[PDB]
Design an enzyme around this catalytic site. Structure first.
Site, mmCIF file in Angstrom:
data_model
loop_
_atom_site.group_PDB
_atom_site.id
_atom_site.type_symbol
_atom_site.label_atom_id
_atom_site.label_comp_id
_atom_site.label_asym_id
_atom_site.label_seq_id
_atom_site.Cartn_x
_atom_site.Cartn_y
_atom_site.Cartn_z
ATOM 1 N N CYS B 46 -62.323 76.406 -32.801
ATOM 2 C CA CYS B 46 -61.329 77.138 -32.044
ATOM 3 C C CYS B 46 -60.358 77.806 -33.049
ATOM 4 C CB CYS B 46 -60.529 76.199 -31.010
ATOM 5 S SG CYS B 46 -59.082 76.997 -30.188
ATOM 6 N N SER B 48 -57.190 77.935 -33.088
ATOM 7 C CA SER B 48 -56.067 77.096 -33.410
ATOM 8 C C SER B 48 -56.365 76.293 -34.631
ATOM 9 C CB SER B 48 -55.750 76.157 -32.283
ATOM 10 O OG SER B 48 -55.168 76.978 -31.260
ATOM 11 N N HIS B 51 -55.702 78.512 -37.318
ATOM 12 C CA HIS B 51 -54.251 78.709 -37.448
ATOM 13 C C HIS B 51 -53.673 77.671 -38.388
ATOM 14 C CE1 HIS B 51 -54.143 81.772 -34.614
ATOM 15 N NE2 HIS B 51 -53.790 81.069 -33.554
ATOM 16 N N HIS B 67 -60.123 69.822 -32.345
ATOM 17 C CA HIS B 67 -59.547 69.434 -31.082
ATOM 18 C C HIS B 67 -60.425 69.827 -29.928
ATOM 19 C CE1 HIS B 67 -58.020 73.566 -31.769
ATOM 20 N NE2 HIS B 67 -57.745 73.624 -30.504
ATOM 21 N N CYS B 174 -61.138 72.476 -24.682
ATOM 22 C CA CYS B 174 -60.117 73.448 -25.035
ATOM 23 C C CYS B 174 -60.427 74.846 -24.539
ATOM 24 C CB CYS B 174 -59.953 73.426 -26.518
ATOM 25 S SG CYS B 174 -58.878 74.745 -27.098
HETATM 26 N N1 LIG Z 1 -52.509 78.195 -24.909
HETATM 27 C C1 LIG Z 1 -53.372 77.256 -25.273
HETATM 28 O O1 LIG Z 1 -53.363 76.112 -24.818
HETATM 29 C C2 LIG Z 1 -54.355 77.573 -26.385
HETATM 30 C C3 LIG Z 1 -55.544 76.833 -26.480
HETATM 31 C C4 LIG Z 1 -56.593 77.333 -27.238
HETATM 32 C C5 LIG Z 1 -56.412 78.512 -27.937
HETATM 33 N N2 LIG Z 1 -55.203 79.198 -27.905
HETATM 34 C C6 LIG Z 1 -54.964 80.416 -28.701
HETATM 35 O O2 LIG Z 1 -55.591 81.560 -28.072
HETATM 36 C C7 LIG Z 1 -55.913 82.526 -29.099
HETATM 37 C C8 LIG Z 1 -57.363 82.954 -29.023
HETATM 38 O O3 LIG Z 1 -58.191 81.846 -29.305
HETATM 39 P P1 LIG Z 1 -59.741 82.178 -29.378
HETATM 40 O O4 LIG Z 1 -60.367 80.883 -29.749
HETATM 41 O O5 LIG Z 1 -60.166 82.803 -28.108
HETATM 42 O O6 LIG Z 1 -59.694 83.235 -30.595
HETATM 43 P P2 LIG Z 1 -60.642 84.378 -31.237
HETATM 44 O O7 LIG Z 1 -60.256 84.708 -32.613
HETATM 45 O O8 LIG Z 1 -62.027 83.983 -30.880
HETATM 46 O O9 LIG Z 1 -60.318 85.684 -30.423
HETATM 47 C C9 LIG Z 1 -59.186 86.482 -30.755
HETATM 48 C C10 LIG Z 1 -59.627 87.832 -30.208
HETATM 49 O O10 LIG Z 1 -58.503 88.738 -30.256
HETATM 50 C C11 LIG Z 1 -58.953 89.956 -30.881
HETATM 51 N N3 LIG Z 1 -57.861 90.724 -31.494
HETATM 52 C C12 LIG Z 1 -57.163 90.415 -32.612
HETATM 53 N N4 LIG Z 1 -56.189 91.288 -32.846
HETATM 54 C C13 LIG Z 1 -56.281 92.129 -31.813
HETATM 55 C C14 LIG Z 1 -55.335 93.084 -31.553
HETATM 56 N N5 LIG Z 1 -54.400 93.367 -32.455
HETATM 57 N N6 LIG Z 1 -55.501 93.762 -30.392
HETATM 58 C C15 LIG Z 1 -56.518 93.492 -29.585
HETATM 59 N N7 LIG Z 1 -57.421 92.537 -29.828
HETATM 60 C C16 LIG Z 1 -57.307 91.824 -30.955
HETATM 61 C C17 LIG Z 1 -60.043 89.540 -31.867
HETATM 62 O O11 LIG Z 1 -60.855 90.667 -32.218
HETATM 63 C C18 LIG Z 1 -60.753 88.435 -31.097
HETATM 64 O O12 LIG Z 1 -61.833 88.940 -30.308
HETATM 65 C C19 LIG Z 1 -55.476 81.895 -30.415
HETATM 66 O O13 LIG Z 1 -54.110 82.324 -30.573
HETATM 67 C C20 LIG Z 1 -55.505 80.402 -30.127
HETATM 68 O O14 LIG Z 1 -54.594 79.726 -30.987
HETATM 69 C C21 LIG Z 1 -54.164 78.723 -27.120
HETATM 70 CU CU LIG Z 2 -58.629 74.939 -29.179
#
Ligand SMILES: NC(=O)c1ccc[n+]([C@@H]2O[C@H](COP(=O)([O-])OP(=O)(O)OC[C@H]3O[C@@H](n4cnc5c(N)ncnc54)[C@H](O)[C@@H]3O)[C@@H](O)[C@H]2O)c1
Ligand SMILES: [Cu+2]
Ligand SMILES: NC(=O)c1ccc[n+]([C@@H]2O[C@H](COP(=O)([O-])OP(=O)(O)OC[C@H]3O[C@@H](n4cnc5c(N)ncnc54)[C@H](O)[C@@H]3O)[C@@H](O)[C@H]2O)c1
Ligand SMILES: [Cu+2]
Ligand SMILES: [Zn+2]
Ligand SMILES: [Zn+2]
Lengths: 374, 374
Positions: B46, B48, B51, B67, B174
């Site tokens: 993931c 995160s 991150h 996680h 997650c």
């Molecule tokens: N809120 C929660 O409980 C929680 C839980 C899990 C993940 N998250 C967060 O959600 C986010 C996404 O996680 P993921 O696993 O899906 O990530 P990921 O990296 O797979 O996807 C991110 C997507 O955003 C795109 N992107 C990046 N910059 C861009 C921009 N400037 N404009 C448009 N598109 C753009 C990327 O190309 C990618 O497809 C992360 O910030 C992660 O930390 C939050």
């Molecule tokens: Cu996660």
């Protein structure tokens, strides 16, 4: 009978920012089609009128401001079907055209025909009905109630019950419905809940009245003016806190007092900083914060987005979320059935010509609402 | 065989920000009172977790991160009652202690015993269960699933079905539940609505499965990587736009496309500027915007509070609003009954030892979810 003809009368014209209102003779045109000319009976001084003077709320000058008021139709233009001469009415600063996206949505009330987002200061058809000194004067939110007579579009007026006391129900045209609806319709305060209200001016006391009507068990009022506390406890505050008495910042004080954050908070002042403070002191996992105050034009706040990620909800609304032409008749009817009181909010009643004295009372902190009578 | 003894095993340790994970031999202490030790079977990569490597999400280093996973319980400590040895479980990065104000509230899920607000990187009792060359290694969000064995508190684990494919359902720990719950539970997307989803990675594609199932009529996926578009249309987007294709800013394109703003938007990237763009492209009177992305540490966004006063709602949520221990067994039971497909999110299955390769596929735009098998 003035119908069909221009009326010359007095209005309080604001020719430029940070100046007194000038009481002058203006000429008010007769209504065009779907327009209504209204003899004003009482108008309240709201803090957004003062925002026009201080330049915080930008709208074209010169202007006849005024938006919280009640009056009587003196004539209707061609095609008016919802009011008749002789009806008591309240001008609506948020219109309800009934035909747009928002009017047709079940929750929205900020009709797309409003003049608040990009103020033109005119009638719906783009012109002014006011002349003063040979010059056209602008309208304000299509209401312009600091005038003995005004003309409004039909989508901006609601007929109210003919027995209403117009020098009290003019607060339903703005302060009271804004405060009350933010609590019961926008935040949806639930029974049992702890609420904190930042700002205890007329809208803020009306937010307390709505929280107490929704059954909040604790309603904390926050103001730096301790003279506001007695009236806040009088309308429902279970306690009042003044930020200057404490050595810790007020968001910590309220979080300690509510054992982790309030359930609902309300910013009802118009400051970028108390808006982030109000969001912060609500519980991080399920707290709801509602912005009601009008911010200084074109200023951005700064906030940490983790305040929302944990679960907080941040919302704002115009006119307490009420669809205005449907809701104002019904709120006047509830006032008549004694469902809520408006008298704690009225601290001063002055003749229209003391408008500038009414504003000084608001600025010095001595009034909640001053009603000006024509 | 292992019960009661320290297990020596392989775990991916991150010793320093911006370095690859180091596959180390660590000693995993046995479970103390109300802790469960788990043998890992499948764990996903993931963003995160990336991150932590980036320094975007601060948590004490060295750490075993991880996680999103699923395993089989190996031994329980004194007093565990909700799982027994041999049970399939999914560890919960948001606990559900059952006893705090949030857990007792019907709508909040960010349990006060979480380790996400000010990461301590320890078990609930303030100590580590992991050592590597005599040094304690910190836990991550009470789960640390990048290890062949981990120890979790009982408030952080959910027993699931005995028949669950553990290499599909680790996603419910997650990525999937987070995106799905954001749309159906946090935004509560309505039938017929228009949704805009910024970020089409694993969590954004699960937000598109949640919108499509809540009945959204139009689902606009937005990503700067045009290769993500085909899997977004396969799980449900009606169209996808790429910001870099346009000369005007993407909030304008989106407002123009949806005829005045979308009904629901979601930021699923973790950037401050798209958090404000996603708020702006939703309808000004009644639009809802939900932040799902994790913002960079200690950075503040700048926004004009008039975006909210007109009627918009802004909210964020962790783990898609789901009370973890209660919801993760039901989502698995629903995966089982074919209520949703997990398979389009898994693009790469690699053995655990190739963890660093699974991260370079994420950082390169090539995978949605890589599942690492043990
Ligand atoms: N809120 C929660 O409980 C929680 C839980 C899990 C993940 N998250 C967060 O959600 C986010 C996404 O996680 P993921 O696993 O899906 O990530 P990921 O990296 O797979 O996807 C991110 C997507 O955003 C795109 N992107 C990046 N910059 C861009 C921009 N400037 N404009 C448009 N598109 C753009 C990327 O190309 C990618 O497809 C992360 O910030 C992660 O930390 C939050
Ligand atoms: Cu996660
Ligand atoms: N959203 C709407 O539709 C709408 C409608 C009407 C009014 N408004 C706005 O609501 C706000 C309240 O209007 P009002 O008429 O009640 O105003 P008001 O001036 O009567 O009330 C302001 C109260 O805020 C207090 N205050 C000032 N600074 C404070 C601070 N730093 N901390 C705590 N308290 C502070 C003042 O002492 C005062 O008691 C104004 O900005 C007005 O423009 C918005
Ligand atoms: Cu007002
Ligand atoms: Zn309308
Ligand atoms: Zn809890």
């Amino acid at each position: 009978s003035t119908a069909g003809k221009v009326i010359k009368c007095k209005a309080a014209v604001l020719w430029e920012e940070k100046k007194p209102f000038s009481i002058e003779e203006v000429e008010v045109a007769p209504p065009k089609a779907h327009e209504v000319r209204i003899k004003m009976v009482a108008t309240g001084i709201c803090r957004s009128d003062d925002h026009v003077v201080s330049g915080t709320l930008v709208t074209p000058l010169p202007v006849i401001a005024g938006h919280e008021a009640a009056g009587i139709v003196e004539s209707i233009g061609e095609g008016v079907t919802t009011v008749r001469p002789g009806d008591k009415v309240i001008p609506l600063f948020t219109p309800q055209c009934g035909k747009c996206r928002v009017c047709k949505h079940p929750e929205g009330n900020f009709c797309l025909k409003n003049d608040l987002s990009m103020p033109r200061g005119t009638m719906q058809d783009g012109t002014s009905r006011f002349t003063c000194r040979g010059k056209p004067i602008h309208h304000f939110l299509g209401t312009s109630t600091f005038s003995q007579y005004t003309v409004v579009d039909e989508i901006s007026v609601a007929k109210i019950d003919a027995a209403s006391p117009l020098e009290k129900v003019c607060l339903i045209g703005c302060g009271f419905s804004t405060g009350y609806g933010s609590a019961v319709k926008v935040a949806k305060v639930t029974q049992g809940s702890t609420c904190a209200v930042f700002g205890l001016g007329g809208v803020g006391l009306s937010v307390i009245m709505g929280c107490k009507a929704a059954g909040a068990a604790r309603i904390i009022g926050v103001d730096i003016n301790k003279d506001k506390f007695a009236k806040a406890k009088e309308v429902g505050a279970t306690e009042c806190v003044n930020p200057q008495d404490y050595k810790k910042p007020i968001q910590e004080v309220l979080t300690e007092m509510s054992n982790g954050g309030v359930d609902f908070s309300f910013e009802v002042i118009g400051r970028l900083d108390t808006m982030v403070t109000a969001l912060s002191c609500c519980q991080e996992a399920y707290g709801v914060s509602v912005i009601v105050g009008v911010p200084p034009d074109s200023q951005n706040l700064s906030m940490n987005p983790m305040l929302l990620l944990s679960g907080r909800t941040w919302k704002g609304a115009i006119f307490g979320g009420f669809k205005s032409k449907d809701s104002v008749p019904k709120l006047v009817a509830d006032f008549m059935a004694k469902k809520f009181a408006l008298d704690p909010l009225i601290t001063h009643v002055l003749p229209f010509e003391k408008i500038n004295e009414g504003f000084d009372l608001l600025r010095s902190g001595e009034s909640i609402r001053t009603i000006l009578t024509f």
